Design a binder for these strands. Structure first.
Ligand SMILES: [Mg+2]
Ligand SMILES: [Mg+2]
Ligand SMILES: [Mg+2]
Ligand SMILES: [Mg+2]
Ligand SMILES: [Mg+2]
Ligand SMILES: [Mg+2]
Ligand SMILES: [Mg+2]
Ligand SMILES: [Mg+2]
Ligand SMILES: [Mg+2]
Ligand SMILES: [Mg+2]
Ligand SMILES: [Mg+2]
Ligand SMILES: [Mg+2]
Ligand SMILES: [Mg+2]
Ligand SMILES: [Mg+2]
Ligand SMILES: [Mg+2]
Ligand SMILES: [Mg+2]
Ligand SMILES: [Mg+2]
Ligand SMILES: [Mg+2]
Ligand SMILES: [Mg+2]
Ligand SMILES: [Mg+2]
Ligand SMILES: [Mg+2]
Ligand SMILES: [Mg+2]
Ligand SMILES: [Mg+2]
Ligand SMILES: [Mg+2]
Ligand SMILES: [Mg+2]
Ligand SMILES: [Mg+2]
Ligand SMILES: [Mg+2]
Ligand SMILES: [Mg+2]
Ligand SMILES: [Mg+2]
Ligand SMILES: [Mg+2]
Ligand SMILES: [Mg+2]
Ligand SMILES: [Mg+2]
Ligand SMILES: [Mg+2]
Ligand SMILES: [Mg+2]
Ligand SMILES: [Mg+2]
Ligand SMILES: [Mg+2]
Lengths: 207, 86, 80, 79, 122
RNA sequence: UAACUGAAGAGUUUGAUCAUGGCUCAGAUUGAACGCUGGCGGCAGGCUUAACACAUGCAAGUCGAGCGGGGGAAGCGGACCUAGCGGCGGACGGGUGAGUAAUGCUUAGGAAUCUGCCUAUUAGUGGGGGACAACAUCUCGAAAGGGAUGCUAAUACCGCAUACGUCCUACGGGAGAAAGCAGGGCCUUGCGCUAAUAGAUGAGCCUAAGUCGGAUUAGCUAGUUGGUGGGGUAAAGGCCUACCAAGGCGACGAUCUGUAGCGGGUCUGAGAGGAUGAUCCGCCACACUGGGACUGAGACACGGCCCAGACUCCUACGGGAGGCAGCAGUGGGGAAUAUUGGACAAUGGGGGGAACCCUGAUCCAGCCAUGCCGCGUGUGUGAAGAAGGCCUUAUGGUUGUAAAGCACUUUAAGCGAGGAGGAGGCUACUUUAGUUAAUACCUAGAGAUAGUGGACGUUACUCGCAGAAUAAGCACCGGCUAACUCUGUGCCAGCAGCCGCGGUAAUACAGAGGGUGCGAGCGUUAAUCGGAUUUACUGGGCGUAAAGCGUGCGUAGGCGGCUUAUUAAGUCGGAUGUGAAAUCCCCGAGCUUAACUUGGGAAUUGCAUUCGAUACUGGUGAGCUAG
RNA sequence: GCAAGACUAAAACUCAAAUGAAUUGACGG
């Protein structure tokens, strides 16, 4: 399953933008109910803490800006705890090497959900195959192209506009003419937004 | 027995059992003649009974009615028991 | 009788055989004397199709083991 | 090439057979202290040599009797 | 205490006891109810608690509790019972499963409908 | 180059406090069950209870190239088929966990042993005889099953002959086998048969050490413990026996007694531990209950026999038959667990020279959210912040970019086309090498030319068509613990893991709105470990919280001053065997990914053997004087 | 054990406390 519902709700609860609604003039001032958690009495609530609410809301934040559910997320964690480095950055690199996220980052698909219907509908090519699993771990060097019968639809070319002035990071060398990939090695805990405090997630999964 | 081969095996078991019983009884009878002669005490009678009993024991051990080690044991013990007679 | 045969353990519809030297009365996937190689009939990509320890094979065909038909033709594929 | 044990003769009243006590120091698995355990072996001396109190040496043989598969090699300390 | 004391006499475990002896390590149990009646709670509580007196296929005969508002049990009803004791009723250590063999689901329920055997209303 | 990385606390005794101490809670797990809900796929798993009773079908046959008879299609016959007898198989594979606390199992070692088929190696396969089935004739019986009279062949049986080696010898000697069949030109090949050896396999035997409780079970044993003669085994042995001697086992737990298949492993845990022994592998035991043996290389034989028993069934009353803990299936019991499916295509197994036949093993398919893993149920924009619901101070707030609206997309499901791989081979066609009168025949080896050969199977997979179209629920919201308001109710109805809520503004009951958490699932019950340092080895205590015996003396035991020599038992180090595979872990390899499958390592911390080191502990000798 | 009894020594069931030391009050014939 995947979450199919109101999306600005998730940003209003998580406080931050969350990067959903990849919009022309969203600017997180498209809902105008921002700075106000959802619901009948989410208004008079700025929030203090619980130290379990803190860990939980950190985890839900990281989970909702990648579209992962809780079973897959806990599997990511159990794998990242196994790799030799630190657990939190291992986890962030696992979430970074997913195919739908790499598609979002290279520029095709405006959101991570549009980049997920792109992948699920086989409009993507990974080293030649027409994959349709959004959770495939792209490895260093893999080539990510658009499919031939799906590179003239305006949805991707007009998302390539939002791809600039926004992104195409260091660890991804993408040309917007051939519509191609070559994702190079994974990022580190210096290339990703630093407000994500993944130590909260590591301490949540040790409760 | 349920299948036809199981009852054929039962038939053949009956026939083999009769045959083997005759041969095994024969071996025991010759050993008993040797032992009765030994208890008699005479050395000539004992040695002739032993000379008659050895080929029957060897014959029935060749056919698998008794094992060859059984045959060797009888041939060894009866011999040691007739050599002590004289 | 000692035989050299295939023991089928893989996945459903994707067999993977261990070439084993065993006593022929044992179950196909049960007790064996010695594993000497393997056979992967599908073996896509970079995977090995057939590995067959030749000196152990020769040692056992010397002690009187009898290969199967399949293991005979496979031992023909090797050393060649 | 053989397996030898050493002990003390605790009985000799049986016809040409001794009872020997082998002492062993087995370490406790959980509490890690070597505790003394003992085992009585019915061994075979055909000459009726060893007397109760001797220190002797035995070696495992084929069975000589029901519960007697050890045979004496010599007396170390004729006490 | 001392090492020698531990090697001589070890450390003894006190095995626990089941709080649901009449279930016989089964998750639930079928019973036939011989008495449907009401009890009053303990010291600080006040109610008319609906209780069932079942004979179980495991040979026991125990009192279980009927949860929810409104039931249809009588004598000779075949019910499924499970663990879980009611705090203020001393000695009731079982619950009747609503929506089971003879115990129907609670009526007019719309929240926590799984726990009362109520089907989704349409 | 990795094979490792690891440990959280809360509530509750009081007016409050600190402590002690129980109880309870948050995690992981499951062959689960139950409630509500339910789209798909891939992998697994699926009577845990009555080792309760079983309808019906199937689960062990095969060989005519061992042998007589027969029977008949096509042409007096040749091909073919097979009831008998005789080979081999039926001791495997499959099921179960009742019994079993040690004749089991695990680890490490041993002798005194056998071992069909297979591999090498030797020496042979000479010549006779008497039968018995089938068959024919009659007969008993309801049947099952039998009887009688003749006739028969054989690789069935038994003599005789001859033994490289084999066996017994008192060392001189003595003793002991076999069987032919087939293909080609009496000769050769094979396939058999005999006698041995040693290799494999497989099994039997022995030793030591471990393997749940219970002392509110302390004595047990009289073939019992040992010896000798004899007998018996494939083999050591009180295994059996007669005699002799008296022993043997026990508080390091004998005997008795409750429980229990055991291991690799599994779950949990930071570990140390603790629970556990489904599925997979090994070992053992068992086959309706209790005995017994036969035949065989192997059985004291799951679908063999005999005898006893219960139970079921047929009967003409005389008699007969049967054994799902094989696969399906039924009744029953139960909270609860599936189809009376397909094929031998693959891997095996049995028979056969082969052709081939058999195979409920296996490979597949069905059913079940039972688990794990994967995917889907759309994606963008969209404010008049519509309507409606809910709250409201009646203005507004909230549901909410949510919806409409506009623009796209087509996974999976549906419908069409293609489409691997699982099949190595065999048959024909030519040759080479052999063996041998022989280029025959038979073995092996090549080469290309076509025939074949897939249960699954509409296979995976690929490519088109259509259309947002076919696809979201469950628990919770007082604290622990993430998430709150209204209305109804009024110590009632009810809720409840614990604390506790409810007596007229209930954030705790019921409904609604909103929200949180999970999601094709979500809750509840049950169970194990955890948190619990709450049995404390790692890692606790005992003045007053539970806890120092009333006090001594002493047995077993534990532990013991200082110096020195020696030993090398403990201890340490190395080497060498072993520690099955699977699993766990690490690298990496294939499935579109993941589950899953798989290569190699690491590990298996053990035990054994052997070599070394002697500080410490122990032994032994010698001293000393602080106890 | 003459007996009175002593010693060894449970379980079902039940409760969510029981307890120690100290503190602030109140009370004390
Ligand atoms: Mg036959
Ligand atoms: Mg014995
Ligand atoms: Mg026939
Ligand atoms: Mg059992
Ligand atoms: Mg013959
Ligand atoms: Mg002869
Ligand atoms: Mg002859
Ligand atoms: Mg003796
Ligand atoms: Mg004797
Ligand atoms: Mg003797
Ligand atoms: Mg005892
Ligand atoms: Mg049992
Ligand atoms: Mg712990
Ligand atoms: Mg045989
Ligand atoms: Mg026999
Ligand atoms: Mg059988
Ligand atoms: Mg049966
Ligand atoms: Mg069955
Ligand atoms: Mg029933
Ligand atoms: Mg087959
Ligand atoms: Mg499709
Ligand atoms: Mg094919
Ligand atoms: Mg809260
Ligand atoms: Mg409720
Ligand atoms: Mg109210
Ligand atoms: Mg409510
Ligand atoms: Mg899922
Ligand atoms: Mg503990
Ligand atoms: Mg304490
Ligand atoms: Mg006290
Ligand atoms: Mg005192
Ligand atoms: Mg002392
Ligand atoms: Mg001492
Ligand atoms: Mg040493
Ligand atoms: Mg292993
Ligand atoms: Mg001294």
């Amino acid at each position: 399953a995947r979450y199919i519902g109101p999306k600005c709700k998730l940003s209003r609860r998580e406080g931050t933008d969350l990067q959903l609604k990849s919009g022309v003039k969203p600017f997180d001032v498209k809902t105008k109910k921002a700075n106000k958690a959802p619901g009948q009495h989410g208004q008079a609530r700025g929030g203090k803490q619980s130290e379990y609410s803190l860990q939980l809301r950190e985890k839900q934040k990281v989970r909702r800006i990648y579209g992962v559910l809780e079973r897959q997320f806990s599997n990511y964690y159990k794998e990242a705890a196994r790799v030799k480095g630190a657990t939190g950055e291992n986890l962030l690199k696992l979430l970074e090497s997913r195919l739908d996220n790499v598609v979002y980052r290279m520029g095709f698909g405006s959101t991570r959900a549009e980049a997920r219907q792109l992948v699920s509908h086989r409009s993507i090519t990974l080293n030649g195959r027409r994959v349709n699993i959004a959770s495939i771990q792209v490895k260093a060097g893999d080539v990510i192209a658009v499919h031939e019968g799906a590179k003239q639809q305006l949805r991707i070319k007009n998302a390539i506009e939002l791809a600039a002035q926004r992104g195409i990071p260091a660890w991804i060398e993408v040309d917007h003419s051939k519509l191609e990939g070559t994702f190079k090695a994974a990022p580190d805990r210096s290339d990703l937004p630093a407000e994500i405090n993944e130590s909260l997630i590591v301490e949540l999964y040790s409760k | 027995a349920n299948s036809a081969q199981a009852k054929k095996r039962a038939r053949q078991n009956v026939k083999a059992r009769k045959h083997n019983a005759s041969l095994r009884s024969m071996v025991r009878t010759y050993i008993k003649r040797t032992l009765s002669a030994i208890a008699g005490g005479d050395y000539a009678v004992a040695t002739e009974a032993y000379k008659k009993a050895v080929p029957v024991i060897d014959r029935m051990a060749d056919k698998g009615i008794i094992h060859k080690n059984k045959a060797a044991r009888h041939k060894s013990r009866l011999n040691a028991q007739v050599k002590a007679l004289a | 009788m000692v035989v050299i045969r295939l023991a089928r353990g893989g996945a459903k519809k994707r067999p993977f055989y261990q070439i084993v030297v065993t006593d022929s009365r044992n179950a196909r996937d049960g007790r064996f004397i010695e594993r000497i190689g393997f056979f992967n009939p599908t073996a896509q990509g970079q995977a090995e199709k057939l590995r067959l320890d030749a000196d152990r094979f020769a040692h056992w065909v010397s002690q009187g083991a009898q290969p199967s038909e399949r293991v005979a033709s496979l031992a023909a594929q090797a050393k060649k | 090439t053989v397996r030898t044990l050493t002990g003390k003769v605790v009985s000799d009243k049986m016809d040409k057979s001794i009872v020997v006590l082998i002492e062993r120091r087995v370490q406790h698995p959980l509490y890690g202290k070597s505790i003394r355990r003992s085992t009585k072996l019915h061994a075979h001396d055909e000459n009726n040599v060893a007397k109760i109190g001797d220190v002797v040496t035995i070696k495992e043989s084929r069975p000589i009797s029901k519960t007697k598969a050890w045979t004496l090699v010599e007396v170390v300390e004729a006490a | 205490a001392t090492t020698n004391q531990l090697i001589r006499k070890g450390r003894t475990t006190l095995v626990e006891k089941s709080k649901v002896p009449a279930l016989k390590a089964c998750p639930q149990r079928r019973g036939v109810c011989t008495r449907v009646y009401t009890t009053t709670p303990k010291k600080p509580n006040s109610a008319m608690r609906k209780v069932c007196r079942v004979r179980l296929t495991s040979g026991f005969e125990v009192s279980s509790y009927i949860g929810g508002e409104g039931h249809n049990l009588q004598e000779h009803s075949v019910v499924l019972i499970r663990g879980g004791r009611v705090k203020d009723l001393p000695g009731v250590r079982y619950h009747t499963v609503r929506g089971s063999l003879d115990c129907a689901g609670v009526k007019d329920r719309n929240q926590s409908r799984s726990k009362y055997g109520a089907k989704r209303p349409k």
